[PDB]
Amino acid sequence: MGSSHHHHHHSSGLVPRGSHMTTRYRFTDEEEARRAAKEWARRGYQVHVTQNGTYWEVEVR
Known part of the structure; x- marks a missing residue:
């Protein structure tokens, strides 16, 4: 027996x-490469x- x-209690907040x-x-x-370039330009x-190969990339600077 023991009560x-x-x-x-504590209260954590982060x-x-x-x-x-x-x-x-x-x-x-x-066309999607040109649309992205134009959307980011806007x-x-x-x-x-960057036409690296079969896939045409868009550098976002």
Whole structure:
């Protein structure tokens, strides 16, 4: 026999966060690569369409 008649409590309060740069957009279709380049251009970002191979990428700077 034994009564825990004074239990204790605390109060934890924090905010976590997740973030990362380097947003690599790559397209297989030429028109989707040109649309992305034009969409980011309208957004005011400096872009470069890199035809690396069979897939045409869009550098977002």
